Ligand binder design. Sequence first.
Ligand SMILES: O=c1ccn([C@@H]2O[C@H](COP(=O)(O)OP(=O)(O)O)[C@@H](O)[C@H]2O)c(=O)[nH]1
Ligand SMILES: O=c1ccn([C@@H]2O[C@H](COP(=O)(O)OP(=O)(O)O)[C@@H](O)[C@H]2O)c(=O)[nH]1
Ligand SMILES: CC(=O)N[C@@H]1[C@@H](O)[C@H](O)[C@@H](CO)O[C@H]1O
Ligand SMILES: CC(=O)N[C@@H]1[C@@H](O)[C@H](O)[C@@H](CO)O[C@H]1O
Ligand SMILES: [Mg+2]
Ligand SMILES: [Mg+2]
Ligand SMILES: [Mg+2]
Ligand SMILES: [Mg+2]
Lengths: 597, 597
Amino acid sequence: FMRYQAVTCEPNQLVRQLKYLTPRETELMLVVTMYNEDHILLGRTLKGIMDNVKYMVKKKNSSTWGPDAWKKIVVCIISDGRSKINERSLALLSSLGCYAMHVYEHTTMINITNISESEVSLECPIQLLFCLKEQNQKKINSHRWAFEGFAELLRPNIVTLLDAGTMPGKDSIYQLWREFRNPNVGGACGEIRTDLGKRFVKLLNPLVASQNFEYKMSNILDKTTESNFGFITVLPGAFSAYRFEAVRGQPLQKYFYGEIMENEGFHFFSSNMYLAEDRILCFEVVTKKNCNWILKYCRSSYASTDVPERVPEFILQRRRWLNGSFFASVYSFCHFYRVWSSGHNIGRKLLLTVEFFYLFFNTLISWFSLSSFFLVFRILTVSIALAYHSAFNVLSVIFLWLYGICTLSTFILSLGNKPKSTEKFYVLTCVIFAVMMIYMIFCSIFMSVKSIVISLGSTYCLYLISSIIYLQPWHMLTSFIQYILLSPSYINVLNIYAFCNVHDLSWYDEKKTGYYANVRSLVIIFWVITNFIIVAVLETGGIADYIAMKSISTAEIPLMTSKASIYFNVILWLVALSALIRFIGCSIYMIVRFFKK
Amino acid sequence: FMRYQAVTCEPNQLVRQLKYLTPRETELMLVVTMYNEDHILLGRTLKGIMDNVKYMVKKKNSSTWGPDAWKKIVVCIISDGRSKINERSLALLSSLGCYAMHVYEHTTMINITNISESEVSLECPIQLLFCLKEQNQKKINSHRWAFEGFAELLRPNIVTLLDAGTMPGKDSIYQLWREFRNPNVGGACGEIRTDLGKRFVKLLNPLVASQNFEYKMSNILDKTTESNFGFITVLPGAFSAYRFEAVRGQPLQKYFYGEIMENEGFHFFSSNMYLAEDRILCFEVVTKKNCNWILKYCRSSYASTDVPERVPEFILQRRRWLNGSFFASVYSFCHFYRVWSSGHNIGRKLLLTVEFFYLFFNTLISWFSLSSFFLVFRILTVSIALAYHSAFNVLSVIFLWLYGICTLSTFILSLGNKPKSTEKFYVLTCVIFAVMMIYMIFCSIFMSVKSIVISLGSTYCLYLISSIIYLQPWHMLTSFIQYILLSPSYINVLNIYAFCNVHDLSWYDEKKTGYYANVRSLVIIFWVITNFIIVAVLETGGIADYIAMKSISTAEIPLMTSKASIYFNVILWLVALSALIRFIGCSIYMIVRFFKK
Ligand SMILES: O=c1ccn([C@@H]2O[C@H](COP(=O)(O)OP(=O)(O)O)[C@@H](O)[C@H]2O)c(=O)[nH]1
Ligand SMILES: O=c1ccn([C@@H]2O[C@H](COP(=O)(O)OP(=O)(O)O)[C@@H](O)[C@H]2O)c(=O)[nH]1
Ligand SMILES: CC(=O)N[C@@H]1[C@@H](O)[C@H](O)[C@@H](CO)O[C@H]1O
Ligand SMILES: CC(=O)N[C@@H]1[C@@H](O)[C@H](O)[C@@H](CO)O[C@H]1O
Ligand SMILES: [Mg+2]
Ligand SMILES: [Mg+2]
Ligand SMILES: [Mg+2]
Ligand SMILES: [Mg+2]
């Protein structure tokens, strides 16, 4: 029998698991967010999930799992908007027997075992729950339905979040479950790999090989470092898991409804916490009152994602990430004091205070990223031009003028225009920034051999020793940095478009838009002016004029200022310190895991 | 009897004057454009008009006018949108017996003779035609109805255009009519005065006294200079008149429908001539094939307008004007060759070629206005700071940093934000620019007395000798420049908001918006980069770095470059040349008028 349920009231006022002779246990609930993904995309996740349940059922020596393991997993497919959905994937789900909200629950005895370039094969259990929405709402609404709703019907021990188009490994979800046997854990997630295509073909699209080294090394370094301390910045939306009893109560409330205490007028946080999504749950769980919850990252579980392969949609995607990380870090740091109001033991409290300071340190770096790249590029170019001379001086003003035209055009196109409409100019901007990176690397090697080299070798060797330690080093030659030429475009074209588009305006609603416009246009000017105060302490902005005039009072301006070398060696010292901290975190994670095992 | 007509088809497929036993002659048709003006505003124009017809009827020695003069004038009130209209003014018109289009025609035997602050008195002919639209369309649609429609019903000898809220003088419209007795004239207009308020009270709002010296001297100089040569740039929308037979045919067609020869794709002109409105009629009339039409400006007729008195709506209004002047001048110059394809006599052809070059020269100045003001301010400040030293150096970087913050904020607020939403910041920006102007004037006088002064005195004396010649010099002490402190804000805050908002986007329509966004974001970068090439030839932008590096190849950078003095004395020489040309034009206009009289 196939059943169906049409939800009509919000989750707060709102499953088959509970509707059973013996109350089933949601030992793990996997939430599949699908907006308008291609049939192959959404099919990929469900295909990866099946194999996981197969492994969970054919195990022998386990008190929790076994031949009856299939009962205690529920897969919820939360679809966002019927109108925009692709009927191809719906036909796929109907072949499985699975096809203001709709609810479809069925038990599919058939498994999808083959997925070619265009054909998916079905042959002859999985408890599927296909939740279909009526009208498009932000993903936060889907999470609202997941947590305010079906959680309290199911009473999950664990809740796992998946995106359609993501590949849970052959054995990922079971390894993810094995983390919560330790009672002090609150959340866990799995490493995300990029789909480099059959025979590593997509490794061609320079972007698909720039996001590959950006996902591989992020999973190698940041997740392990954060999980050592106890609070992981982002449980990634692709593949993450929270214990329900941990998140239950205050964290759900302040993640959904915003900061409760609010007047009619808007304040900063209570009116700007939408930017950081699924990054507030971590904070409100780890620093809970009278609780000692920890966040861990599970290495033995992996999921391989799809990546956008053309520059416009790349920028549109990363603008969400940059704003989320900024607002979440600023909030969670500005409320670091309640870490000490929790139930953590004193050692845990000290560890979490240290780590929160570490994250705010990282965000303070990512805010000065724009000026840091400009001064690295500009001092690196002027240095070769002021020692090599030759075609470097013309290439210095040429690249400066190219950098200026591209950057000014990036502000103007971000503020006034849209990315899809000017595609070839972005491709040219990325190529210009890539040849700028080639020029900076050329200057690096040339100046080094004719004489920074210690620090560059040290950071690359830390990368390599950590990458091999993680047992995934092939990426470091899979084009990686060779295709990381997109990095210049990571620092400038993505940040500019991110902060120039903080709030994603679409002109109670009008006053809301006006206030958001003012906050947007004010964070932009603070970004620009603070970065330029750093830049001007190069001594731009009439500061060199001022010093020259003072000297005249008792001359002419110099071209280079030690402040650039101090700011040049501080930047490298600082990035080497960050790499060293992350490598130490990964090494401790590995030693602990291997010793325990 | 009161009649009414509801137009349903566009003007192309479309009056009482023709519907008469003896065909009435539209010796002059006055078009009143009203959007949502206050009762007093629209009432002001109709009140000013009445007096005009009274004068026209009580004359004695005239072949055209006399006791029967009231018949040969038709007043058409073209209202743009019933929904947004104010019913107060409609009650006013109903008291007169006057109240996809509606048409009201009545003969009001009563006259409005008293208008107090809030009371308008009626006592006991005027042929009124109150044309009311169904749905809001751009003013160009109202002109479409005026010209494609009621013109060919009436067959006007003359068509005069008025705005609701504008005061035709005691005797203005008759003086305007007296211009077309000369057969070679094609268009004429009247001088526009600002309403400085009872006892010159509104002379307080610094803006109402900044637009006053901006209207008084514009009418004194530009209209007379242009009317000497034959082609007046803008017949001002407030009060202007065109002979119908002159405009009839090609000029109407290319003013309404755009450039006919067009493919599916967009080109520059055929897809960007909307910016210049009512500025294309002049071109297509003066340079008509096999015709020798002239444009003249009538001094003996005046109209006093209302002005916005707060900074937001000021900026919103002037952004239309700046874009219109730019696009019209660029088009009319890039088609200067057909001046020689006309029916003008060789002297007229040479005169019009010279004047078209003069207008394109003026627009070439108004395009480099932004860099000209920055270099005037910056060199003027650095000059005092490099000779006076003292508190000027700190005030140099302080004003530079204030100029930079205000200008960057102006770009960011123009591109991303709206003016109404950030009002106090614009008021502060205008005050900062005003104290910057006070500082520049202080530097001017201080450096002059301790030692530009010849040129400044010469231009002010040309202003004064011309202003008195025009018989309206009191304005030059009515605060004028004292309240022209808003000028800094004229050059920067208005131009920045004008070019940063070329096309007034509101995201066939989508491709249109994308193309307009690209053209907008491309004219912005050309504006910025061309101005900055001028700025960088100050030697900003690594150009001083380049020269220093070349010198090193065989040192350090200098603070000041003669290129600034050359660019400083060229700017003053050039503005003095423009003032001299305009004064000569006004003097010739006056001598000719007085000799003829
Ligand atoms: O506005 C959004 C963003 C995300 N999603 C859901 O979250 C997934 C993540 O989207 P995607 O991977 O295409 O890009 P991302 O949003 O991660 O940048 C989508 O597939 C949807 O299931 C959604 O429904 N609406
Ligand atoms: O978008 C517009 C602009 C102008 N007008 C008409 O033209 C007059 C001029 O408007 P106003 O004097 O208020 O400001 P301006 O448009 O001249 O800046 C208005 O009164 C209307 O009659 C209109 O109907 N719609
Ligand atoms: C701070 C940050 O980058 N967070 C992102 C998160 O937004 C994203 O959902 C996830 C994979 O989808 O990868 C994480 O690294
Ligand atoms: C080039 C220019 O400034 N033209 C304006 C015109 O747009 C305006 O309609 C008129 C008075 O309303 O005054 C003119 O000076
Ligand atoms: Mg997707
Ligand atoms: Mg995806
Ligand atoms: Mg009006
Ligand atoms: Mg008006």
